[PDB]
Amino acid sequence: GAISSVLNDILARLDKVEAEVQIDRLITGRLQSLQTYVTQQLIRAAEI
Amino acid sequence: NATRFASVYAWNRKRISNCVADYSVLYNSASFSTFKCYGVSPTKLNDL
Amino acid sequence: NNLDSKVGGNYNYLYRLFRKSNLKPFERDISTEIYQAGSTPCNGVEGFNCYFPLQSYGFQPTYGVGYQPYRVVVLSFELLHAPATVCGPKKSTNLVKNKCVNFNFNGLTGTGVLTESNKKFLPFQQFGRDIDDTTDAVRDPQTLE
Incomplete structure (x- = not known):
């Protein structure tokens, strides 16, 4: 939802x-992607 | 700073190319009651 | 108003009062042709329930602010798709290689290292990407290296 x-x-x-309203979306997308990735990796770290 | 401009029924589009711009001559001039933009900040235009 | 308003009305200028629907952005319509406003079709130059699609500007300097004319421009532009044929007035520096640098090229501001590239660009490219989707090459805008 950010301009780019x-x-x-x-x-x-x-x-x-106005940069705030864009950058805050990028923080939101990325942070969620890392909470996803680290939880997926944690579940795998037990598979190992 | 030209004299004539079009009607809204038949608005003139002109293309700008192969040249260098300057927007300080807009943003420093009270000739314009408005200079309002949606994808960039006015002072950034100089570097864009 | 202090330029364009005419003592009787500057009727030379027109706006569109009717169309079949609404338009797509950047559509310029140069039809004079009569709009149809009832169950009847139209023939000839005009008719009953056929309405002329434009209306003439009656700018007089006796009118109120708002009813007065106001000159308008729409400076429109696009970004980083292509080798930027327009740019604002800022000055260059001399070039530097292989030291950590706050680089810029046409507004692509970043921190990086700039190194002589044996990547086989054709005459057309400005930039290069990779398998991790990262921007990894550029051709200097003054020297085609």
Whole structure:
């Protein structure tokens, strides 16, 4: 939902107030992806 | 700074290419009551 | 208003008052042709329940702010698809290789290392990617290396 997935493309086109509304989506997507990946890997780390 | 402009029934599109821009001459000028943008911040335009 | 408004009305300018539906973005319609506003079809230049699709501007400087004319521009543009044929006025530096650098090329700001590349670009490419979807090459915009 951010203007772009390259975070340098937020930081090269937007100032702080509106860049926040974009960057916060990128944090949300990525952080969730890591909570997913580490939990999937934990479940595998027991398979091993 | 040209004289004439089109009607909204037949609005003129012109293409800009193979040249260098400057937007400080817009953002520093009270000739315009509005200069309002949706994908970029005005002061970033100079570096974009 | 202090340019374009005419003492009797600057009727030379038109806007569209009717269409079959709404339009797609960036569609310019140059039809004079009469719109049909009842169950009857139309023939000839005009008719009963056939309405002319444009309306003429009556800008007079006696009108209120708002009812007055206001000149408008729509500066539209796109990003990083292609070798950027327009850019804002900022100055270059001399080139540097193989030291950790806060690089920029056409607004691709980042931290990296710049190294002479034996990757076989054809004349057309500006950039290169990889199997991990990472941007790993660029051709300097002043020297085609």
